[PDB]
Every structure is written in structure tokens, then in C-alpha cells.
């Protein structure tokens, strides 16, 4: 018998743990910011017909540069954000995880650093470390929003190669205004990745509007996993100056996007009008969930996303388990006193709110 | 409009070029070692029916550890190679490319070295460089087979962290015997990755037979892209001791494999006997094609896979263009004097041979 210690693993990986956010198939899943609506019957029918069409070519490598997908992503972005862009501005990969991985390979890596404003996305420091990019954590303010004075101070001092700005922020829910983003971009010496995973849930404009002004610095990261109700298709993308697409083509694995993934994403995008109608339903439930939590006595952080950050427990993890014992799976992001609940369909939110009503009395 | 030089791209990527065969819409495509047979109607019908079933779950993240897929991959390997394995021995990713990338992340990387036997697969050094692993090229012999005295000498001298052995080799087609593989393993200090992408095309035993004997050293890399007739699905995997699965779980992107990828590979696996029946036809066609090339007066390296390496042109790129002009797309693998043709269906091979006969008279 042998174990991992008997293998020539890289030393810095010793004692590490695999990213392991709970993935459980329970009845009430409010833990991964997934859109709670199953894909529409129309979408599914289209998907089934498309697979029937393209299945006979699955012996061949897919189209390497995903041109058709990128055309449709650029058409979406043009309509969605109002900024005219073409496939030359767009690059797709297997989720934002791989998008970001590729950007880190090309613009981070050994000898370089990435700066983020914590608490933010769990994956950013994980991907940074995974690409041998040093991660600098700069703390957000007491209200969980970016503290601009410290932000600009620290960027000036450290000259980071990459700066992450997540807006709306996961886990806190707040939008960093475009004027603040410009301020960040102007002190940034290398590139700035604006992670717009939740943009569709905010009325506020996309950082894509800033791309004309900062071609050499700005990349806008997006995904189909959240508002677009397609996390299982693993499709993330960025919008930037065409030079950046040339950049990532040097590091991307050839044929990194399969034929079914490209075709599935295309089908999804041509059903966007109906699907994105879920964003409106979710925003109404968010307002209701947040209101009710406040009414109960919870400290609720205002949000422009599909989730709510709320506290203040003495032990968030015990609180988290207490929700789970009542069939409600939310998220413990390892921030003292707080948990993140994803907005579900009404009946899931009712179950979460019923659990939360009972749990506040426990004083956990 | 800006230049790549205006972006802060890492310096080693400066003046580099993107990898990949030209995507040319020709009648006879014999450039990427794809199985030329379309997926069977039985497989396609199963796929479509399965998509109809799972598509309703696509708003959720896919099963992260790909347990079902790995179960079926283990079943396939057990039957195919005669070595009893389970899912604990199997790991799947988006192509062999991602599999090798992940192995290089965990066992190669900054400060470490990979060693290969050139000419072999183009992506081994490319992936090495992309993961900041130093690549050591050791020349194969005049017969394009591994020169074992030179191989063992250089492994002892260099003490490389990773050794690549591709068998059958791409682009030359030769099998390195398991006895020679064993000798390499015994001098190799770190890990040995046996790239068995074309294993199914040879009756010779798989290196999976050596796994029980060298558990801390050996990983057998495999794919569904070639004999398994499923390159469009981008599914590669490895067979190894379960400690290796623990290792790559520290470096893989979570949810790296999509719901559709997983489900489609599962469908493909349960149609394996029918699909892999095509190997017989292709192995006999290879012999026909290679024999006719020698009749014509070409220099052919003996192959045991679905392609044939041949020469000796004064300018093989010009020879490549002549084939293209006659409607036949083969591969210029960057080796002076030689080109690599994939074995197609009989009518495709006939066209390749017709063109090859005109071209030899041109003395290119």
C-alpha cells in the first residue's frame, strides 16, 4: 500500500486540501448561486435537436477557435451592455475558472502578483496559487464595500501585475461603481480583471463601457453559470481588446472547448430573452428574502446579486449546519458571523425563511 | 488598435505562435489522427435520449468528481487491458491535454524538468513550457525508435522529474516494448507518464500491466479522441495508483468536466465494442497505405497506429501544399523531409494514394 506522501508531489502542495465547497443533492439548494429555474422546455427541445444534428461529427475535433460561439456572445454583449463588440473582442472557455486560469498564465505566473479585495471570490486566490501567482489580499471596509483610499494606496505601493475587482461582489453583494473602477484602473500598472459574474442582476452599467478607454489594461470576465442558468454547461468568457485574445491563444489548451459545449452554449444564447426573465423573478424574491431576514432580526448586507449575505452568529458554521438539519443548504464562506444564501424559487425561499425564523431563536 | 507588445504579457510568450493545424475545409481530412468513421446510429440515438434526460439539470453545477464516468472508464480499462481497476484508479479531464497539464502542475512546474524522446508528440514540450516545466529533448535513433542506451544514459545524468514515453509514438508510429518501458521506469527518479493515446491500435499489452509493479512512478495516459471515435467530446483520462488521483485533485479546476461531457462519454463507453470494431479495418488500411507508399518509392517508417510517417522531401511544406492542392489535408509535423498522413476510410486512402503518386514525380 502507498499514499500521496510516497509520490513526488511538489512540496508546496503537501498538506493542501482540494477546493471542496459542499455539493449535496438535498431538496433545498441555496448554496452555489445557481439559477434555481431548470432550463425551459423550449431550450431543452432545441438542445436535443441540435445534438441530433451534430452528434455524427463527434469523431472530429471541434472548431478550435469557437468562432460561432464568440459571434453569438458578442451579439449578446452588444445588446446587453450597449457596447458594440465582435468575436474579436470575445474569448470563451470552460467556465470562468479556465478563463481566469488562462489570463493568469499569460499575465501572472512566477515572479508576479495578483491583488484582490477580501472578502471576495473563493476561486481567485486558489487560481492565483494554482498558476504560481502570488496573491495579495487587501481588506474591504466595515460595510464590506471596497475601501477606496486603502485600495489605491495599496495598488500604488505594491504595483500588482493583476488586480481583481468583483462587481457585484461574491459574497457581499455590492457593486463597485464604474468611477471607482476607473480610479483603480488608473493606478494599476499591469491588468485589471473585472469579474462581472453577477452583472445581469444589477441595473448598473457593465465595465465593458470602459474598454474603449483602457484597451491595454482592462479585461471583463463573465459567465453563463448564474443569471444565464447554465452552470452545468461550464461556459465562461471575457470581453476585451482583440490583443488579449491573441495573448490567451498562446496559453490555451488546443481544442479546450468541446463540440457539445460550443453547441449547447449557442442554443442557450438564442434562448436568452426567455431565460433572462428569471433575473426579474429573482430580484423580487431577493427583496422579499432580505426584508424578511431584517424583520426577524438578522444583520443583512444590501445586495445587487442573486444572494444575500447575513449575520451575526457567534459560530456561523453551527448556524450553517442548523440550516442543513432543516433541509436548507446555504453557504459558509468562512467569514466570521455571516452566511450567504442564494435566492431560489418562492417555495425554497419560504423554507429558508422558516428555518431562519427558528434558528435566530437558538442564538447560535 | 494596440499590439501584443503593449500588453504586459510574460516575456517567454513574446514572439510565440499559437499551436494548431490549419482548419481547412477540404474533402479529404487526414491531418489529426481522428477515427474517420462517424459515431454509430445506435450511439447517437442513445446520446440524444440521454440529453433529453439530463438537460433539465444544466442550471446546476455538474457532479464535481465525475464518479459515474470514472466507474465506466474503469470497467472499460479492466476489460480492454485485462487489469482490474476501479474508479479510484481513474481520472478524467477535458482531453489528454488537460490530463497532462494537471499532471505537470502537480509533479512538474517551476524548478523541475520533463524529458521526452524527440520526435514525439508536439504538446508534451508545449505543455511543459506552459506549466513552467523545463523540457529535455533526447533524440530517438535513426530508425526513429527510442535509442535505449542514450535514453538510459540521459535519464541517469539529468535525473528528470517527469519522463514521457509515447507508445505507439506520434508521429512515427512505433511501439516501445514494455521491457524497454520497464528499463526507463527503473532509471527514472520521479514519475513516468506513458502516453497511450493510440494503445487501442496495437495488439501489444498496455502499460497498465506495469501499474501493480511501479505504483509510485507510473501513470498511463489515455484518450477517447482517437480509436474511441470521440475527439469532439474532448475526453482524456489516466490510469494509475489512487494516490495520483489525490494529487491531481489539488490542482484541477473544480467542475472542470461538464454535465454534457460526462454524460456523452458515458454513452460512448457503453457502445465501445461496436465503435472499437473500426480499429480492425483501420489497421489493415494502414498496412495497405504504407505498402503502396513504399511501392511508389517513398521512405516509410513502420507504424503500429492509424497513421503513417513518410519522406524524404527536399521541402515537405511544399509537398504538403501539393497534397492540399489535390484536396488532401495531411499533417506537416515540423520534421524536415517528412509528413504524417492519418488513415481514413478506404476511398479517402485511395485519394491520398492517388495524390501521393502524382507528387513523387514532382521531386518536391
Swiss-Prot record, chains A, B:
It comes from the Bacteria. SUPFAM superfamilies: PLP-dependent transferases (SSF53383). Keywords: Amino-acid biosynthesis, Aminotransferase, Histidine biosynthesis, Pyridoxal phosphate, Transferase. It is an enzyme of class 2 (transferase). Its EC number is 2.6.1.9. Its cofactor is pyridoxal 5'-phosphate. GO terms for biological process: L-histidine biosynthetic process. The keyword Transferase applies. CDD domains: AAT_like. Pathway: Amino-acid biosynthesis; L-histidine biosynthesis; L-histidine from 5-phospho-alpha-D-ribose 1-diphosphate: step 7/9. It holds the Pfam family Aminotran_1_2. The modification N6-(pyridoxal phosphate)lysine is found at residue 226. InterPro entries: Aminotransferase_I/II_large, HisP_aminotrans, PyrdxlP-dep_Trfase, PyrdxlP-dep_Trfase_major, PyrdxlP-dep_Trfase_small. GO terms for molecular function: histidinol-phosphate transaminase activity; pyridoxal phosphate binding. The keyword Transferase applies. Coiled coil: none annotated. It catalyses: L-histidinol phosphate + 2-oxoglutarate = 3-(imidazol-4-yl)-2-oxopropyl phosphate + L-glutamate. Belongs to the class-II pyridoxal-phosphate-dependent aminotransferase family. Histidinol-phosphate aminotransferase subfamily. Homodimer. This is Histidinol-phosphate aminotransferase. It comes from Corynebacterium glutamicum (strain ATCC 13032 / DSM 20300 / JCM 1318 / BCRC 11384 / CCUG 27702 / LMG 3730 / NBRC 12168 / NCIMB 10025 / NRRL B-2784 / 534).
Amino acid at each position: 500500500k502507498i499514499t500521496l506522501s510516497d509520490l513526488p508531489l511538489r512540496e508546496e502542495l503537501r498538506g493542501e486540501h482540494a477546493y471542496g465547497a459542499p455539493q449535496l443533492n438535498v431538496d433545498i439548494r441555496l448554496n452555489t448561486n445557481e439559477n434555481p429555474y431548470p432550463p425551459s422546455e423550449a431550450l431543452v427541445a432545441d438542445l436535443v435537436a441540435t445534438v441530433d444534428k451534430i452528434a455524427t461529427e463527434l469523431n472530429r475535433y471541434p472548431e478550435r477557435d469557437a468562432v460561432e460561439l464568440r459571434d453569438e456572445l458578442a451579439a449578446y454583449i452588444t445588446k446587453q451592455t450597449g457596447v458594440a463588440v465582435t468575436r474579436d473582442n470575445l474569448w470563451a472557455a470552460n467556465g470562468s475558472n479556465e478563463i481566469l486560469q488562462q489570463l493568469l498564465q499569460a499575465f501572472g505566473g512566477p515572479g508576479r502578483t495578483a491583488l484582490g479585495f477580501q472578502p471576495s471570490y473563493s476561486m481567485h486566490p486558489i487560481l492565483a496559487k494554482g498558476t504560481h501567482t502570488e496573491f495579495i489580499a487587501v481588506s474591504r471596509g466595515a460595510d464590506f464595500r471596497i475601501d477606496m483610499d486603502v485600495a489605491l494606496e495599496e495598488i500604488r505601493a505594491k504595483q500588482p501585475d493583476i488586480v481583481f475587482v468583483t462587481t457585484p461582489n461574491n459574497p457581499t453583494g455590492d457593486v463597485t461603481s464604474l468611477d471607482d473602477v476607473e480610479r483603480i484602473i488608473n493606478v494599476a500598472p499591469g491588468i485589471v480583471i473585472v469579474d462581472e459574474a453577477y452583472a445581469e442582476f444589477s441595473p448598473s452599467p457593465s465595465a465593458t463601457t470602459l474598454l474603449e478607454k483602457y484597451p491595454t489594461k482592462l479585461v471583463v470576465s463573465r459567465t453563463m453559470s448564474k443569471a444565464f442558468d447554465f452552470a452545468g454547461g461550464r461556459l465562461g468568457y471575457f470581453v476585451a481588446n482583440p490583443a488579449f485574445i491573441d495573448a490567451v491563444m498562446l496559453v490555451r489548451l488546443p481544442y479546450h472547448l468541446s463540440a457539445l459545449s460550443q453547441a449547447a452554449a449557442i442554443v442557450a444564447l438564442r434562448h436568452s430573452a426567455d431565460t433572462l426573465g428569471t433575473v426579474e423573478k429573482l430580484s423580487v424574491e431577493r427583496v422579499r428574502v432580505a426584508a424578511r431576514l431584517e424583520e426577524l432580526g438578522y444583520a443583512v448586507v444590501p445586495s445587487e446579486s442573486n444572494f444575500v449575505f447575513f449575520g451575526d452568529f457567534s459560530d456561523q458554521h453551527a448556524a450553517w449546519q442548523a440550516f442543513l438539519d432543516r433541509g436548507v443548504l446555504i453557504r459558509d464562506v468562512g467569514i466570521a458571523g455571516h452566511l450567504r444564501t442564494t435566492i431560489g424559487v418562492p417555495e425554497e425561499n419560504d423554507a429558508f425563511l422558516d428555518a431562519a425564523a427558528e434558528i435566530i431563536k437558538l442564538n447560535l
